[PDB]
């Protein structure tokens, strides 16, 4: 009765807005032509539904369990009627593939965070924003089994149900395959014609900034099924929309005796909104050629990177040269001539070494700033690990291995321990790492480029001594670095004023938006000043001196 009325209402709503019908038709046509596969899903905007009918909008927002399934059935009926497949297949006929729904638009007080989710928001549609910390393995889930009875020559089927698969509760169906027909004939399971869907459980953690002072972060579990199975990885920021639910007996059954613990609550995900390379167009290639023809482009590219920094122009040139690397030769004898440049910086304190590292990190396609001083997190080189109790061996890749065909920006190279020194020597010399520990034998490529900074041993660079003396690494390590740069902090009055003013500017620079200087606090997922840069005294600064050739008076805008 009510189910039919709601199905009819959603059918009328879909008829009114032709965009969703067009989207369904487009998905179906793309699937048919490509016979890589578009999922059966449609994204609706809550604003349009609110405009069309307030009752249905409020029902979806407050009573999703009773209002969502009718919408899914209406969409499935529309798709089936619109379908024009002439000849289906045994896989398609028996497949349990209804059409799912996802929601976009503006939420009211339902746009919450993992900390704000309390018991008053249960059985309601919510939008949770946070950070992924855990990601369980992808596993298949049984939702339909088709059997064959040879004697009667008929195909039977049976449907299963679980608390994490349907918004509306039903009697649990144990995963026991029927073995005999009602008439008594023996059945044989047809595995190829059954239906299995994927299943993944992830845990979303509150964003650290929003966490109240002196409070640990709170997390909420999320369940994703079918197409939304492999879309997030740990550490990513997501905005998951789903229905908050409570599962299990929660100690209410007489078997349990705690009588104090509460029920288990999760979210049934409906959609996930996330929170390298740029495809070159036809005229971008023309632009790059135009710049290439200009017989001054090397200086332009060199000084475009890190324009703020004063001096050290040769370092910028060498850093660009490193970024673009050199051809790598593979001889027929298996010999491998290295074709990746390496750079090491050594100098007194406060010479923008970290600034140069940051700029190469920002401009480099790949980079990992794993400092050499106790690199907690990702190790500098690969090293197997085992669990404390289960002893689960596993090869954990280090920074060097995670930069294949890229760059690794080590920091504070002078703080390395003997283990790291020995590992790095082999890594650079051979360009590959072969692990032969804990019964694990494997080879992992490490072709990359290394840039590192290293302060002196006495805290200040001595000119009278060789660079190999001001640094305390053996010749084996230093020889691997193709180019070694020694930089000293020189004091010049004009330079001092320039640096002072440039640093001062930022402090008085403010977060524009609220009373200047006071207590300081994506729209879509699917998705010629462009090339050149207008001069900015605040940022570039020294870049003008670069084209002026060390002349402050020079006003040659570069």
């Amino acid at each position: 009765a009510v189910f039919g009325d709601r199905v009819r209402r959603f059918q009328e709503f879909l008829d009114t807005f032709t965009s969703y019908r067009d989207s369904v038709r487009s998905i179906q046509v793309y699937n048919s032509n490509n016979a890589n596969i578009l999922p059966h899903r449609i994204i609706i905007s809550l604003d349009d539904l609110r405009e069309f009918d307030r009752s249905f909008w409020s029902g979806i927002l407050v009573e999703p369990a009773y209002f969502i399934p009718p919408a899914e059935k209406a969409l499935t009926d529309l798709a089936d009627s619109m379908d024009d497949v002439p000849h289906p297949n045994a896989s398609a006929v028996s497949s349990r593939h209804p059409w799912k729904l996802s929601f976009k638009g503006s939420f009211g007080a339902h746009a919450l965070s993992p900390r704000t989710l309390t018991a008053q928001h249960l059985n309601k549609l919510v939008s949770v924003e946070g950070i992924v910390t855990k990601t369980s393995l992808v596993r298949p889930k049984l939702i339909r089994s088709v059997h064959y009875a040879a004697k009667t020559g008929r195909f039977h089927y049976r449907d299963y149900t679980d608390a994490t698969t349907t918004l509306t509760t039903r009697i649990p169906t144990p995963a026991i395959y029927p073995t005999e027909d009602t008439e008594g004939n023996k059945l044989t399971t047809e595995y190829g014609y059954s239906t299995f869907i994927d299943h993944q459980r992830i845990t979303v953690q509150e964003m650290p900034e929003m966490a109240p002072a002196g409070q640990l972060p709170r997390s909420i579990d999320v369940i994703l099924d079918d197409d939304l199975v492999d879309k997030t990885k740990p550490g990513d920021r997501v905005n998951v929309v789903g229905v908050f639910k409570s599962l299990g007996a929660g100690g209410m059954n007489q078997s349990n005796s705690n009588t104090l613990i509460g029920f288990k609550t999760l979210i049934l995900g409906n959609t996930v909104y996330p929170l390298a390379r740029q495809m070159l167009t036809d005229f971008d290639i023309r632009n790059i050629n135009k710049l290439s023809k200009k017989k001054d482009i090397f200086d332009i590219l060199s000084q475009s990177l890190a324009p703020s920094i004063y001096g050290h122009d040769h370092i910028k040139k060498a850093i660009l040269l490193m970024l673009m690397g050199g051809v790598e030769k593979n001889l027929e004898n298996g010999s491998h001539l290295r074709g990746d440049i390496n750079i090491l910086m050594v100098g007194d304190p406060s010479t923008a070494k970290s600034q140069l590292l940051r700029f190469v990190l920002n401009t480099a396609s790949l980079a990992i700033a794993t400092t050499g001083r106790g690199s907690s997190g990702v190790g500098l080189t690969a090293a197997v690990t085992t669990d404390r109790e289960t002893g689960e061996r596993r090869l954990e890749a280090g920074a060097m291995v995670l930069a294949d065909r890229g760059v690794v920006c080590i920091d504070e190279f002078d703080k390395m321990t003997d283990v790291d020194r020995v590992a790095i020597h082999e890594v650079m010399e051979q360009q590959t790492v072969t692990i032969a520990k804990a019964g694990i034998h494997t080879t992992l490529n490490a072709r990359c480029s290394v840039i590192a900074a290293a302060n002196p041993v006495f805290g200040q660079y001595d000119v009278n001594r060789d660079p190999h003396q001001n640094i305390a690494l053996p010749d084996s390590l230093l020889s691997r670095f193709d180019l070694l740069f020694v930089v000293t902090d020189d004091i010049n009055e004009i330079r001092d004023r320039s640096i002072s003013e440039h640093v001062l500017r930022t402090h008085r620079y403010l977060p524009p938006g609220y009373l200047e200087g006071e207590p300081v606090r994506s729209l879509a997922v699917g998705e010629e000043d462009h090339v050149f840069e207008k001069f900015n005294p605040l940022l570039q600064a020294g870049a003008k001196l670069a084209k002026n050739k060390g002349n402050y008076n020079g006003t040659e805008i570069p």
Partner: protein, 174 residues
């Protein structure tokens, strides 16, 4: 009116603009002195200048682009759930600027939304204003909502709270 601090401040907000003329000597308007202002160039101007430039020109000097506080996102947010919307973050003078916008462009679509939002917010404003305290021995929600009040709403709330408090004090005075 003329001598009204709240009215004066509201006119001081920055609205987007698009110059469609080529005027020299107006460099200081954009960001630098002594540089002619090209045409078809976007810049941010205070309202007290943008309004006059738009009205006075055959062809106005300026063409006011759609502001950022009246975009479709804000309209949808207002229509969805007026009470929980935080107007203070959007703009501290939302209602005065809105009224000025409707008067300037005489748009009959924003008026309905603004009126409904004001009515719905006033319901909760009165709900919170009438809830006083009792010292029986001899607020968290109130503070949470109070931080989301525009300047005009804050003034109305203060006046209503003072009236209610005075009446209660007189009524229960010994």
């Amino acid at each position: 009116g003329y001598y009204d601090i709240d009215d004066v401040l509201a006119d001081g907000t920055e609205f987007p603009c698009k110059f469609q003329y080529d005027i020299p000597g107006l460099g200081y308007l954009e960001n630098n002195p002594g540089r002619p202002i090209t045409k078809n160039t976007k810049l941010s101007l205070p309202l007290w200048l943008a309004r006059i430039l738009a009205i006075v020109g055959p062809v106005p000097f300026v063409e006011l682009l759609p502001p950022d506080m009246f975009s479709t996102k804000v309209m949808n947010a207002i229509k969805t759930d007026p009470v929980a919307l935080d107007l203070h973050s959007i703009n501290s003078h939302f209602f005065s600027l809105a009224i000025k916008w409707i008067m300037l462009f005489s748009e009959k679509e924003l008026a309905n939304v603004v009126s409904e939002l004001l009515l719905q917010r006033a319901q909760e404003l009165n709900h919170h204003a009438s809830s006083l305290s009792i010292d029986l021995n001899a607020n968290i929600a109130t503070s949470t909502f109070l931080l989301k009040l525009e300047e005009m709403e804050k003034e109305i709330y203060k006046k209503s709270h003072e009236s209610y408090k005075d009446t209660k004090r007189w009524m229960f005075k010994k």
